[PDB]
């Protein structure tokens, strides 16, 4: 029920990943840096992740090829709606070829949405891309899977 965010470098990020063999942590590369994704019941295994709680799910983090995450600021006001409002998107993307989960995760030290989705490839999610309570402007990172 919680998932724990850290970006650097990916040669640094597999130094963690490798610490913690039992732990489900996904290191995947984006533009501006690489993430790990560890997702969890239990406690965190960085200094100073972002923390989140999943609030929707679909499907399990195991091997994804492609990573995608809407960063999307809602003002504190703004929460009971936003969440109410994305609690109606799994049932339509989880359909797709080669979707593999969804995360919806509520930010606990920040005012900033992680709406997640893996994917087999990035392939697979561009086909899928054809288909104020908002403090800044959302944005969407890309990563994929490291080798």
Known sequence: MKVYIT??????LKT???KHP????????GQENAILIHETSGDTVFQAPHAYEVIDQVGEI????????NNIAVTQEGRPLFEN??????????NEPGFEAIRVLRPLDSD???ILTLWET????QDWQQSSIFSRPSYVTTYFAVE
């Open 7 to 12: 970006y650097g470098t990916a040669d640094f």
């Open 16 to 18: 963690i990943v490798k």
């Open 22 to 29: 039992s732990e489900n942590i996904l290191l995947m590369q």
């Open 62 to 69: 195991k091997h994804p090829g492609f990573a995608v995450l």
């Open 85 to 94: 409002k994305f609690k109606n998107r799994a049932g339509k993307v989880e």
């Open 112 to 114: 900033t949405y992680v």
């Open 122 to 125: 990035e392939r697979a999610f």
